[PDB]
Amino acid sequence: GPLSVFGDRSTGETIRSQNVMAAASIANIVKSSLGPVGLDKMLVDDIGDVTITNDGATILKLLEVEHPAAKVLCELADLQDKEVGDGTTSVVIIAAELLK
Amino acid sequence: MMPTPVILLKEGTDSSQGIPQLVSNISACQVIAEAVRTTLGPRGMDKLIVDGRGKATISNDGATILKLLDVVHPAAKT
Amino acid sequence: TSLGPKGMDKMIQDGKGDVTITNDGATILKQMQVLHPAARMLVELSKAQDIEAGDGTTSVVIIAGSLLDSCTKLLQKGIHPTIISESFQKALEKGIEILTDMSRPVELSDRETLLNSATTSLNSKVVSQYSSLLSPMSVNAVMKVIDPATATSVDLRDIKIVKKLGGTIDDCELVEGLVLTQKVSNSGITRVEKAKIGLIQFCLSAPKTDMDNQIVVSDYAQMDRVLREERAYILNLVKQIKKTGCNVLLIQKSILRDALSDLALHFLNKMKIMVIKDIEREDIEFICKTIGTKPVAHIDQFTADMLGSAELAEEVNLNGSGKLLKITGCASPGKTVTIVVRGSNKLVIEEAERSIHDALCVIRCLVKKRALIAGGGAPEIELALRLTEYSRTLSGMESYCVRAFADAMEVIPSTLAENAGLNPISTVTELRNRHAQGEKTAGINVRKGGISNILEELVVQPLLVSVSALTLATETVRSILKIDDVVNTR
Amino acid sequence: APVNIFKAGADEERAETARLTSFIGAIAIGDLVKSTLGPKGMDKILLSSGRDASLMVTNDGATILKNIGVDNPAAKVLVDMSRVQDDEVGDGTTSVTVLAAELLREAESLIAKKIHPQTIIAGWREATKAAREALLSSAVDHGSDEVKFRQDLMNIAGTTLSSKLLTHHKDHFTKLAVEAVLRLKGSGNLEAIHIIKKLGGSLADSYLDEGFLLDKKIGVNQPKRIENAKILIANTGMDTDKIKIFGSRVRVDSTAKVAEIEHAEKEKMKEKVERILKHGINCFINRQLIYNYPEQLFGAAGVMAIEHADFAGVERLALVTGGEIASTFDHPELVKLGSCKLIEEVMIGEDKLIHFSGVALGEACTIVLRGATQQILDEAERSLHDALCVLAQTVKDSRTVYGGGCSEMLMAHAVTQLANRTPGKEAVAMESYAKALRMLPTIIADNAGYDSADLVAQLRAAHSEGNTTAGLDMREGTIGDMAILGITESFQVKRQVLLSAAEAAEVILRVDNIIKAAPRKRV
Amino acid sequence: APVNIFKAGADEERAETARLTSFIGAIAIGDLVKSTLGPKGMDKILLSSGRDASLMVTNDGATILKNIGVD
Amino acid sequence: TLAFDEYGRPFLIIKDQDRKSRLMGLEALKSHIMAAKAVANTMRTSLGPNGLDKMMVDKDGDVTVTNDGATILSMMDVDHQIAKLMVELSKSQDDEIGDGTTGVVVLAGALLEEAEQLLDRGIHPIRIADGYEQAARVAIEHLDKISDSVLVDIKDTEPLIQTAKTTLGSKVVNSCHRQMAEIAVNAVLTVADMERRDVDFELIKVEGKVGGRLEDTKLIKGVIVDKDFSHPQMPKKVEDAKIAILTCPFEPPKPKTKHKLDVTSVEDYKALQKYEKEKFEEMIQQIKETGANLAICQWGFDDEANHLLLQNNLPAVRWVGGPEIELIAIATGGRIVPRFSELTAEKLGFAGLVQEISFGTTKDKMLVIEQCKNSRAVTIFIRGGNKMIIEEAKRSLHDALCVIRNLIRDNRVVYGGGAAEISCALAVSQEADKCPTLEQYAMRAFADALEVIPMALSENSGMNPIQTMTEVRARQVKEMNPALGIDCLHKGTNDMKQQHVIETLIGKKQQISLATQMVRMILKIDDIRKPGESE
Amino acid sequence: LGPNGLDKMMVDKDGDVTVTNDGATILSMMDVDHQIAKLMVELSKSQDD
């Protein structure tokens, strides 16, 4: 009857809905730090090292993501730093909205 | 780590506020609606729901579907 | 749901954390890791298509699964498996002759057939929207290195892929020269014009023999007779190189001995000789064909006869995942070409590599057999109608088993209609009516949203794909119907 | 025994369950492979517990039984029997397995009649001798008149292959088996016919290579194709020769001497290659690996060199090229070279192989085996191995017998006619031997789905009144003449099935007591 | 039946062991009382493990079988 | 996602949502059809004259071997909401008609199996369900075209006995193929009400006693009860019975309310002793004054009564149950008398020989009544060599009694042996192409499903279904459609008119209608919400 | 004992199986746990030697 694959398989509207959530969970991080009226974040790791930043690149490099749809936005931010060098906040905000 | 007074105000109470709470409340309403989306019209389908007694009910009337879903979310109950 | 230009891709994540997105049915099945002993036979089926055709990889599985499914209504009527197997064999032998009816002979000089076939294979790929570039690249990558009209085979292992992160698909290259991932030291040159290139396997370091070597010091100045001699030895090696007239060195990686000493590079850097180091023992075969150099094992043989040519040898300063070396232009270029793959994300680049190979395999088939047929489900409808007429002339159990083989043929035009958003009940019926009338070139037009002429849409598939799809699928399922006893060993 | 036990961790069974469990466990082996007997049988898939399970699809009883893992100490007796049959003749492994099982089944029924186990054994010994004479007196000889001898080899090849995957491909693989052996005209090494397995194409697309294929493509800086090449094979050292002095060091006052010795090191390697090249050769194959330095010297000389084609590859090349191993080169005038027409590379299954075509004294060949799946390739390879093993012996012992159950009924007839001349104490046991012999044509018909109730009665009735060539017609489901149909089996294969089942079966009948030592490494 | 079983705690056997185990059990009864057939048969000792072990010697086949507890 | 929102907070809609399961798509539909295949594969093995038996082992260890689908399907442990409905299908057929306990499952399964291809063709799940209605009407309308009977339920009972033989032929009692067929006919026709065509199920009692053989089963024109004469020396034979049915104990009458008699003087103590003695004498003489010579009492007796019963030559039995005294009074034409003082000759029952039967070494003492006067009740006494054949014989005669009742309700019959099913399949196929608007595939699927019965019958009969079906279907078209069926031994030709294979019209009409409705209510579902583990 | 005697099957600790006629092997492969029974085994061994 079912596939003999020993893992977990989801099809149809399940993954089409999850990728929207995972992408939003990343855009929700940097949306609050856009423009001169934005505010900074403090990132604290498990052992007590404290980093202060508001840039989309450092934040997404330090914060771990698990969903394969979220890694796409993290890679997008990394590419912006390589190609341009700046502006790495709108590429995550705009890209997430295109999916929505 | 913030609400750490030497004496607590109430006991252990959960509290949410603002935009994520409204979005959550609307989202709960969108999800519960899924139970009847396929029941509308002359070509709608029926649903089979099994209760704790082991007995199934087969129906398509919203007044019988929504009462068996065991809804707990404060907003979805609306 | 991954069949036809309107199909979709799948994501699979393994237990190590390697996430891939792919369309090719063969690359899906290899990652699913299906355990069932009977379904694993479909993985081997798809493997054979990857070798024999290279682009027959999805339709072979839906056929094989349908042929087995068509046998259920036969087994449930008491028809002995040996009757079903012989009946499908006869249906195959007639099916292949039917396919030749649609064939059209071509020649390798026809640029339009080559561009159209390469384009067709890209319609189902994630790069289908870059076909205006990747298509003439796919044809040019092959037709210049196989010496057309001198051979009946193509060895695609001489078309190399270089993957870099950055840019987009429009930035891909089809450079005819040599692309290396090795580094240059020193970096004070970075570009040489009108170069003579040499390949050296000799180690430019202190002398050493196969035997254990010991230097014995027994006096004061004896230590200086060692240091002064080793310096002279290494310099003498450099002088042999410089007097030859070379400009750029290709140094093969050594394990037991240091290939490039600090003193050797010191003199070479002052003499303006550019050194490319850490070239693997497996890289020299491509270098020898692409540039035309020969290795030298003994420095005393390093003369002009082993040197090649290059019009421009430069380091390419990329803004992405590092940088690369590019050597462009030479006398008597060899039968090699490099494709440079670009992209914004690693997932796209990896799929682009497979799509490039899928297109390259198209010409490989067309060289082996210079004949094509219309696609779009046209040969499947033709088989279904002609095989039905065949079965109408049979008697006995074959009259029920042969039609079952024919019934399986409709699974593809039915699936193609569904994936395109069309109603298969009317689409397949209209297809069978049009072909019965005589419209042998009618099929599913996913661009118009209906049934139209396949040839006008330039959707054309090599004959070998439909011939191999039935040959490999049929033999596989006629074996599966023969294996009927599961024993679990202790 | 169970009362007053004086054993540490061991147990024993006597006279009650010792024989019961021995007969059940051993007879079960026959039922396992019973379904594989005859031309219409079904095949098995054998599965492992995991850790690269390495799924195997096979028909032959020997490959089935040797991978089961039988734990029963009595059932193991028949497993070893099937191993020997595979090693000796390579065919009939199912027939001997099921025959021994049927003999044992009858023995249990005879014990139920209160017949002493030594009387049963004695009866089978007399019945076995009767069956041996039936085979000796019915053998068919083939001597000269090669137009009839070749037909016999085609019949033997067809019979063996009809029971394996290569069913409806007989018109291709029958010739691959018979002709490959005839071309050897020598010792039945069974390694001179190499099989290369490739995916792509159908089984019918396999072919015989008239020459010899090598792996390890033609060098780096060496010619790719030479016409009318002289071939030299070698088993010598290319580099790091370290000539025969153990514990020798270079101890000098300065590095200048090291550089001078390094030149001498290469000069001797240069001389070594020149000593080989003086032979006047075009192709050089050396078992040991070729290093960067001699590769340039051979390239500069216009001579190709192959490194490490295989461990035994050089020995196989010697037989098909007509040369000698030549591990040392110090008298070029005493070294024989081979010769061929083409040394070009060919593309087979998207893999470039070195093709030695037109090779003189080519007493070897290669079969190129094509298939859709790996399971098809592995079972098809085994089918070729089985047919070649029988043919390599048929060309040495031309005696054959009539198949299709003919030989089995002839043996059962001789046992029956003589059993009726013996007193009942033993005749009941001799009759049971004949009954087991008749189970073989019954199983064959039963696997195909034929009405064995009539085929057995008709075949016995035929052989009761002459008709010593009568047998099963597995195409129509009737009784036919084996000589006209051309259904024959090797004498040696049939002899060993008879003798092995009888000898092995006695092992079980003789045992009334099993003593099982305490197990180790079980917690 | 063995594929896609929809039973809670139940099972079933068909065409393979259903008839085999039926024959095994029927013969097992026969072999028990076989020794009591005829004028020279042997007698049995029937006992339980305890709780009034109710030791009985019997010959008659019906008396034997009605005290075994066939499962 | 559930239990995780885009803001990192938990997302909880329903209680214990992580332990639920929902899968809609086409997978709910394929799962329902697939589960039905497991059910159909069971019942197909017991269809036809060669149908094989099932052994059912109950939760308490009890074992019974049966053929009756009602006894097979009712003892299942299947925990699947749709497979349970397949059992209800067999129940509805059993309650209304009582024959097709196997047929409706095989037919309904075929409709679900053939529907599988229709979903894969892209046909809307509901359009499939509606398409079956258009084809079903065709089969039903033609089913009523070919029918005839000569049964009058007076004396020409030949086709009625033949109907009982057709039904019983599938059971394990063919050693009594004729004997039980005649018993069943006589049992019903002697109690049936010809005026309304009603048969009261309570007027035929079925009893049994382990021992003997099936050939010893008899129809008794009377009643059988557990006889236990209160006095052990009472004569056990009454030649001409005048039966008093009484529902009062043979003891001095007592009030129902709280009494508490006050006794003070010795004259009160002794006087009561006399009065009570007289009550024992009067209650017995009040029976003799009516001419009665056999009393049957719901209650027990006092020791004083047993002596008086002896001296007055008045046999009696004790503790006869509620339904037993009800049936005795009706069978004997009498009435139940409340009290002793209300006894009168007009309420006495009339019967002939009264005897008790002893069976082997046991003390069962079962009643037999030889003669009766216009009785409207009968008793069947089933014998057998083991408990299993007797219990199966009860069901075997039950089916035979039911099909007789069905002919009384409606005397229209059809030809069996698959002739009706093949003819219907051909009729639907002819109209399936009039007109192929949308439903061409669905109507043909219905026609193919109808053939599941002669095909399964052919398999169980040992024939190839292709070789058998192709010949019969051709012969029914080349010539004016005869009642041509199939059989295992062929009996010469397969002419159902000569084999006398008779089935009821209203039986098959219900099998088609009930199977179709059951399929519809389980196709039109695309969501199953069954709970998983408790915690 | 004697030409009409029956043989024994000895199953060794490693799974090897041998059907034996001679007493020395029959007894040497038994896991005897009794001080006097072992001496009876030694008796058979001495006769074999």
Residue numbers in the entry:
A (entry chain a): 3 to 102
B (entry chain H): 1 to 78
C (entry chain M): 50 to 539
D (entry chain L): 7 to 529
E (entry chain B): 7 to 77
F (entry chain E): 4 to 538
G (entry chain e): 50 to 98
Excerpt from the publication:
The eukaryotic chaperonin TRiC/CCT assists the folding of about 10% of cytosolic proteins through an ATP-driven conformational cycle, and the essential cytoskeleton protein tubulin is the obligate substrate of TRiC. TRiC is the most complex chaperone system identified to date. It has a double-ring structure, and each ring consists of eight paralogous subunits (denoted as CCT1–CCT8) arranged in a specific order. Each TRiC subunit consists of three domains: the substrate-recognition apical domain (A domain) and the ATP-binding equatorial domain (E domain) linked by the intermediate domain (I domain). Here, we present an ensemble of cryo-EM structures of endogenous human TRiC throughout its ATPase cycle, with three of them revealing endogenously engaged tubulin in different folding stages.
In the current work, our control experiment of cryo-EM analysis on human TRiC incubated for 30 s with 1 mM ATP, a physiological concentration of ATP in the cell, further revealed the ability of human TRiC to close both rings, with a non-negligible population (27.2%) of such closed TRiC being detected. This both-rings-closed TRiC map resembled that of the closed TRiC-tubulin-S3. Collectively, our data imply that the both-rings-closed conformation occurs in the TRiC conformational landscape driven by hydrolysis of natural nucleotide ATP. Still, the ultimate judgment of whether the both-rings-closed TRiC exists in the crowded environment of the cell remains to be further explored through in situ cryo-ET studies of TRiC in normal cells.
